[PDB]
Amino acid sequence: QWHTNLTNERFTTIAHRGASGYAPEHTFQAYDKSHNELKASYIEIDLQRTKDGHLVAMHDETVNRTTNGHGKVEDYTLDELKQLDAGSWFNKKYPKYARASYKNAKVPTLDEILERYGPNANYYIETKSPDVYPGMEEQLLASLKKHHLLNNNKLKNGHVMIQSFSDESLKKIHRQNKHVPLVKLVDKGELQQFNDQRLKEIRSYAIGLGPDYTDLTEQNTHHLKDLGFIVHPYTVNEKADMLRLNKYGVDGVFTNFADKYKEVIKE
Numbered sequence: 001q002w003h004t005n006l007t008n009e010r011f012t013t014i015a016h017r018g019a020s021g022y023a024p025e026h027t028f029q030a031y032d033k034s035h036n037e038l039k040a041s042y043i044e045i046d047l048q049r050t051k052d053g054h055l056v057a058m059h060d061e062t063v064n065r066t067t068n069g070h071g072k073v074e075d076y077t078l079d080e081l082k083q084l085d086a087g088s089w090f091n092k093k094y095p096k097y098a099r100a101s102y103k104n105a106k107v108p109t110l111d112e113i114l115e116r117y118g119p120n121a122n123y124y125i126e127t128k129s130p131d132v133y134p135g136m137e138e139q140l141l142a143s144l145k146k147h148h149l150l151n152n153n154k155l156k157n158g159h160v161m162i163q164s165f166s167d168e169s170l171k172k173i174h175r176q177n178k179h180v181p182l183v184k185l186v187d188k189g190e191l192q193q194f195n196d197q198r199l200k201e202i203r204s205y206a207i208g209l210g211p212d213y214t215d216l217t218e219q220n221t222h223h224l225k226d227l228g229f230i231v232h233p234y235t236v237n238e239k240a241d242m243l244r245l246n247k248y249g250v251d252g253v254f255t256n257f258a259d260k261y262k263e264v265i266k267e
């Protein structure tokens with residue numbers, strides 16, 4: 001009597017920032033790997049916006065960590081951002097997975113991503129506060145619609161899952177389009193902090209809940225599942241934990257190693 005992934009999968013494999021563990025996060029390389037090669041359930045995307053308003057995939061608000069550049073993403077125009085090298089940094093940090101082709105990987109725009117993997121892929125997109133990038137939500141939905149991902153059919157098959165730590169952002173989207181599946185990202189330790197009334201309300205606009213995996217235990221997991229939630233704890237890269245969590249009853253996980261999780265599911 002619980003809820004199961006809209007993709008109709010008992011266990012969904014969310015490729016955290018793409019094939020994050022083997023390729024430079026948020027790059028065609030990383031996405032190609034997790035989607036084509038490892039064949040993971042979702043292409044997980046983190047949104048940031050350029051100076052001239054282009055939604056692009058990048059985890060931090062600054063290009064420092066993942067490029068040969070410095071500054072806030074919004075200080076760069078899409079054109080300038082495209083000059084950056086979004087791959088080299090990966091070779092240097094993870095020599096054991098390094099690859100010559102990773103050099104000069106580019107930062108992708110949300111449009112390019114949807115464009116590239118088409119309307120049959122499944123996307124897990126994250127938004128920031130309605131104050132940090134005003135208009136982000138309206139833009140995301142417009143982009144999704146452009147790429148035919150807002151069709152009700154696609155929506156109830158799990159082709160789209162919008163996630164965020166900002167209740168404000170999710171609520172804004174829910175008002176604008178009640179049909180887009182929403183996932184509330186819970187912070188580390190924050191899961192405990194909120195009671196049933198809280199969960200009850202979160203559940204009024206979000207079908208899913210994505211807590212830090214370390215805050216999960218078989219009991220709360222069951223409880224959440226009971227409250228009608230779909231649970232996708234985040235960034236589980238250890239087979240051991242993958243197995244444990246699956247036993248608790250989760251519906252999938254965010255991971256930088258799609259294959260490890262898919263194998264744990266196979267067994």
Ligand code: NA
Binds near residue numbers: 045046126
């Ligand atoms: Na994320």
